[PDB]
Subunit: 342 residues, 4 copies
Amino acid sequence: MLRIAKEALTFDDVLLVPAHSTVLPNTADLRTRLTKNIALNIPMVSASMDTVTEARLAIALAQEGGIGFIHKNMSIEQQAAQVHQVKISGGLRVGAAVGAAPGNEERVKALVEAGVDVLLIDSSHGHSEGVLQRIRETRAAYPHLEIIGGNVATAEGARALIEAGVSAVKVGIGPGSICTTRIVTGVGVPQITAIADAAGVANEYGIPVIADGGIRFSGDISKAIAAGASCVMVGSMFAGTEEAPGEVILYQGRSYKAYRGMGSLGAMSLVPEGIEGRIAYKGHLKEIIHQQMGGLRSCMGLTGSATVEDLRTKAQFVRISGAGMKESHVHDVQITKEAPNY
Amino acid sequence: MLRIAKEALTFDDVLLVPAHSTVLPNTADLRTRLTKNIALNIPMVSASMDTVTEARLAIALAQEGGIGFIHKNMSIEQQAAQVHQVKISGGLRVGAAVGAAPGNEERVKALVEAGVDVLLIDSSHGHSEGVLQRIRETRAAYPHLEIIGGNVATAEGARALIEAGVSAVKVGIGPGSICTTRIVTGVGVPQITAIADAAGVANEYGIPVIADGGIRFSGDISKAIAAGASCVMVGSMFAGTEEAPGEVILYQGRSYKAYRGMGSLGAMSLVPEGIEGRIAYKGHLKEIIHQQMGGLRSCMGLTGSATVEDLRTKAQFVRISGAGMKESHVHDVQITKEAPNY
Amino acid sequence: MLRIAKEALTFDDVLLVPAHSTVLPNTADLRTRLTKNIALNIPMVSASMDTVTEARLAIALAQEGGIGFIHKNMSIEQQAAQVHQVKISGGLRVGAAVGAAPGNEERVKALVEAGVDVLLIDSSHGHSEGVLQRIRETRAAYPHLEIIGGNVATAEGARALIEAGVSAVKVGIGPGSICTTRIVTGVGVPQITAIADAAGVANEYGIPVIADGGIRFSGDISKAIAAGASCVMVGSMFAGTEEAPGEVILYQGRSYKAYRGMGSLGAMSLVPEGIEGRIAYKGHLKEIIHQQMGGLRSCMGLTGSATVEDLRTKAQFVRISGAGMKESHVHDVQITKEAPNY
Amino acid sequence: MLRIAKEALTFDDVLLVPAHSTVLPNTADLRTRLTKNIALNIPMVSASMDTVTEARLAIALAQEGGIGFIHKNMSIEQQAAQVHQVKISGGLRVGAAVGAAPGNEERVKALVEAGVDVLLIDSSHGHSEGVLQRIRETRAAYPHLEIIGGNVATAEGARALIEAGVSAVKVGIGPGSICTTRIVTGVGVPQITAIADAAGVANEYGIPVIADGGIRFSGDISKAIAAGASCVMVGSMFAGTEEAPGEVILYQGRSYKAYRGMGSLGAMSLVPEGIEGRIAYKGHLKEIIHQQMGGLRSCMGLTGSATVEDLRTKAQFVRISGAGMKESHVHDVQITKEAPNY
Ligand SMILES: NC(=O)c1ccc[n+]([C@@H]2O[C@H](COP(=O)([O-])OP(=O)(O)OC[C@H]3O[C@@H](n4cnc5c(N)ncnc54)[C@H](O)[C@@H]3O)[C@@H](O)[C@H]2O)c1
Ligand SMILES: NC(=O)c1ccc[n+]([C@@H]2O[C@H](COP(=O)([O-])OP(=O)(O)OC[C@H]3O[C@@H](n4cnc5c(N)ncnc54)[C@H](O)[C@@H]3O)[C@@H](O)[C@H]2O)c1
Ligand SMILES: NC(=O)c1ccc[n+]([C@@H]2O[C@H](COP(=O)([O-])OP(=O)(O)OC[C@H]3O[C@@H](n4cnc5c(N)ncnc54)[C@H](O)[C@@H]3O)[C@@H](O)[C@H]2O)c1
Ligand SMILES: NC(=O)c1ccc[n+]([C@@H]2O[C@H](COP(=O)([O-])OP(=O)(O)OC[C@H]3O[C@@H](n4cnc5c(N)ncnc54)[C@H](O)[C@@H]3O)[C@@H](O)[C@H]2O)c1
Ligand SMILES: O=c1[nH]c(=O)c2[nH+]cn([C@@H]3O[C@H](COP(=O)(O)O)[C@@H](O)[C@H]3O)c2[nH]1
Ligand SMILES: O=c1[nH]c(=O)c2[nH+]cn([C@@H]3O[C@H](COP(=O)(O)O)[C@@H](O)[C@H]3O)c2[nH]1
Ligand SMILES: O=c1[nH]c(=O)c2[nH+]cn([C@@H]3O[C@H](COP(=O)(O)O)[C@@H](O)[C@H]3O)c2[nH]1
Ligand SMILES: O=c1[nH]c(=O)c2[nH+]cn([C@@H]3O[C@H](COP(=O)(O)O)[C@@H](O)[C@H]3O)c2[nH]1
Ligand SMILES: [K+]
Ligand SMILES: [K+]
Ligand SMILES: [K+]
Ligand SMILES: [K+]
């Protein structure tokens, strides 16, 4: 009577199993794919959010081997200009977002004319007739444009996007840090299972999966890749960097920047699907990426994964309980110094 | 040796799976049934509680497409008068509660004479000889009166109520926010399983199930409907509105109203089965309903549920762990603004 | 490789399922057995602890239909005198504790001479050669003395005690509120499973099981009985009453009494297996018993259990998750008044 | 699609089952093995950490029947001198650590010349070509030197170490109190399962398993042994003792010592895998060992384990839920005095 499809898992439900290794962290190969036609030197892309990615962060991230997605909460002229600013900064790639609603044809044309490398239809509605037909329309108009459609969280959603013509499948319905879709609507799929379910289909086509949302610690990047993702999209992890939009706010001896959902009231201007918040100031993006990729390298040394494909297709998990996750964190000790990756 | 019937689930144990959709939130159809003979434009009814539903809230709720149940903690004359006040307010429907104990015949007669649309026998003892024979007596005296009996939490309880002649089955033993039945007695069934178990029987008869208690967020409304309920009954979600009984209380810069169980000592005047509390002031009921139904509409857009029946009979769940629920909430960020639906 | 016998449950893992009922709380029959030869009017006995049971509480409890166990942390003459004081208070029954170590023969003789109704060998070592041979020695010396041996937590422990000649089996290794055996030693069995496992054996002999430790709320009493216990032993629930030993301590506007484990350093005067604490002052034992038995009566009304035997042998459980237990408690509301049973 | 090998358990997921006993705590035999050739009078060894083990603690621990591992964060001359200082203190055994990287030949030679009893290659990379070939090189150079290699967390890791020539297998990837490997990398195995998996292989060879990390309470020592370990390695439990390195720090009326991971930035001088912290001051190591071994003795009395081998090979577990662990701790009472083992 209760129509329950299966028990789905998230990052804190699993750990990666150490295995025979010939890999040292400094020899690990971090290269991967965003699409069949767009390679990345590291498996990180930035969220299309108004508190994460404008040209400044997109440039810095691309210089580190990732790609940024310029957010849609600005005029067409402004967004095209940001794309152009990244493109003229010496051989760098950039993406840009547009919404799922009809009437974005002019915006897409302007972004393409500005040299955008990949268009994102930025939505939770990947498995909808509207988004699928938007993808088909876009693929007709731009036969050689790399396209990522709305997010999905299932095998059938991934298949539908692929059949519509996307270049990569992005996975995540409500796992975001600043996000309340799952609470407001009741809808979502724990992210590890969501990634694996999508990958089971996408792998058949050689189409990359992008794991979007819920990444808190560098270890979550490893887990997302092992679940089947070719790369991760992050908001919180990059929010609060110097390069992210917004000024640094001093409060009670500590520094912060604003970070908000794109379905928050502030971002939309209504029934919101995110909140408005503040996040500790992180310093420069370069050091954050170094910390995060250091964790992933150390993972690859422990799992014996020479490349991201090895991690993505060969590494094994164990299922854990809540006590297992409490043991994984610091426990039974007072932390006197905050570590740069914790 | 341990007589354990099965593992039962509640709202936070499950999420709804996104599916193919042709539904936009503004095209979703929220109409449903309270009984075979009483339709609702939205799937919400208010609790028969002395801190939730008197005529003022019953009127406002009926104007929004729901129905209120006037509580029993007042004299017969007062309760009939409240019913009458809702009935003369332009085409509005109303319910009213009576207790399970013998001797309520005069009260029932007065409520019927005042034009009550549906009588509720307001109790946790739906599966008891007393309540079942009270239903039979009432159905004999008023062959055309819509009747809802005591609450149940099982398939057999639902069957018994149906065989006694009820017009809808209401489900919930102790899930309420302000309620302690399960702690004081040890008795209850997690609400998602309770709803599904009742619905498995009630569906055979075309008899609506009402999911009563434990609804905290709009996403819980979606889940209750998908578990099999035609509509939800809420106390906490409407307590604290301007229209609910009681005055607004200012304390340390914030406003509150009283909210208490009907088995609390205060409400009964003894071994209580609820507590007395205060709840943040919510403003006008209209905006709360708009927020809550906005969440449900957004659910229906994501699940592809065109109607409440589609959600109730076709949408699928996934089982989740505690980590999955922590990911669903806001996490790893400081909330600087409270959202109207969170 | 990991020798794991099975997954064991405690009170918060389960709820009782409501069933057809002809029972009202005021008609429920609370009578039960402590042993085949000692009946109780209510299913409650007090812990043999120096912060719970001396003559004053033993008298008050016996007047309410239970039995107290006078603790062993006093001289032989003092303990015999306390027994005598309960016996001369008009037809009342009393128990008394002795430790498991050799050399307690004189103490046992003095307690028997004072008229003790039941002797408890007060220990966690029920399944030990020493305790079993102590029981055999005692049964030889006093062929008609009701005897309860050391605690057990397994079927085989219960069988061994029965074969040694006990009159009741007491179950509980480390579930106590003030107790640390499970943390210090790593040994124990979650109490619901422990009770059921013991009862599976004891039921074959018609020998009562006493559920000792871990009872926090009245609903836990219901659950212990449904798991197979004929009655419960409580420390925390009665500590802090006016009748318990110790003076009332005022601190920051609230009143307390001391409550400590019998393996705490304070009680022993070493490697302790309990702690020293304070518990809120509860008032008179009579009102506490009324609240606790009111909860049990309300359970019996909901489960349709006319007698304690019906609850003990017929009522069904459902297994629940942590979300199910959070729903059972008060949730999402501020408690402005503390209820007498919560 | 999700490559999940099995559900793995940690200390708080399990309890030991009481069994028939002829063992009293004072008759329990605590003797065990560190290697086939090195016996221990108690099953405790100290972590090779710069805030746990230098000569002073190594001497005190060896006098109590354990063995200390002098940490590697000092010059060769200094480390050899510390070894020598323990060796000349009247018949005492000592170990010493070296890192996994090439170029430690001189350090090993100096430690051997100073009389070290056992060499530890102190690493998380036990299952790596580098560590395995380091073990082989060392075994070639010192055919009669007791060697422990890098840590492992799997059956295959244990087999590989054994085939390379180790004298004991040490188990633990990231369970440490002050440690963040699992969070930073995503890699690890809950410690109870890790120990059992290693032991399943090591038992075939008669090779001891050492359970390293995650031990918080004395009951965890019992559980590690029952999972298959011959002895435990502890950092937190001994940090903060008078004999551990570092001065006592007074802060707000309480005393502390520093305790930090060996992958913390402070210890390494970078992407750290531990943190820097402070731990409450514990007093002299002798009393801590007495408390911890008192807990283990009490376990052995309850499980009927006459020897450590009996506990290690015969004692049974039950799986528990989070409610079972909450019952095991102190609950529902205010602790007015801190117990020496809690
Ligand atoms: N990945 C997620 O779980 C998630 C969820 C909500 C919001 N968001 C973020 O917020 C922004 C808005 O995302 P969104 O579009 O999912 O939020 P949304 O559900 O508010 O939809 C936004 C617009 O798209 C159209 N739309 C609404 N429901 C639709 C449906 N069921 N099918 C097709 N089209 C529909 C409407 O025109 C609407 O104004 C984006 O920047 C996105 O990244 C993400
Ligand atoms: N849905 C729930 O889980 C729940 C539980 C307790 C109270 N309540 C609320 O509190 C109020 C009282 O509800 P209640 O009647 O369940 O509380 P209750 O158990 O206190 O019963 C109230 C009255 O009904 C009769 N009654 C008591 N036990 C009975 C039984 N086992 N069978 C038949 N009749 C019995 C008695 O005359 C009693 O005074 C109502 O407004 C109700 O909504 C709800
Ligand atoms: N039910 C429990 O889980 C539990 C646990 C510890 C203490 N206690 C309470 O504390 C008091 C002491 O109880 P306890 O005796 O279990 O604590 P314990 O384990 O400290 O034993 C106390 C005495 O009994 C003897 N003893 C010790 N270990 C034994 C063994 N393995 N087999 C046989 N005899 C042994 C010794 O002489 C010892 O001094 C009692 O009042 C009891 O209620 C209860
Ligand atoms: N048991 C654990 O889970 C754990 C984890 C991290 C650190 N530590 C502690 O911190 C210290 C450093 O331990 P570590 O060496 O595991 O930390 P690590 O991963 O930082 O490695 C330290 C050095 O060993 C070499 N190394 C790095 N990765 C390697 C790999 N994949 N295979 C082979 N060699 C590699 C490098 O030269 C590196 O500088 C030790 O004292 C150790 O006890 C323990
Ligand atoms: O449910 C949502 N409501 C929102 O308001 C919202 N805004 C962003 N997003 C999504 O969250 C991702 C960022 O997540 P993290 O901060 O966890 O990296 C992003 O990359 C998006 O997928 C939203 N999701
Ligand atoms: O166990 C109970 N003790 C009480 O004192 C009590 N009062 C109300 N109710 C029930 O709780 C429902 C309201 O629940 P929410 O606040 O969660 O919406 C209501 O609609 C009722 O079903 C009670 N349940
Ligand atoms: O592990 C233990 N260490 C102790 O120091 C201790 N003292 C009492 N007891 C046992 O706890 C029971 C009382 O438990 P409650 O307070 O939960 O009712 C009692 O009835 C005893 O079974 C102890 N258990
Ligand atoms: O992940 C790690 N990062 C670190 O920085 C670190 N330093 C020590 N160790 C390991 O932790 C063990 C001590 O653990 P406890 O404090 O829990 O006894 C030790 O015995 C080591 O196995 C580390 N692990
Ligand atoms: K850890
Ligand atoms: K979220
Ligand atoms: K509740
Ligand atoms: K306990």
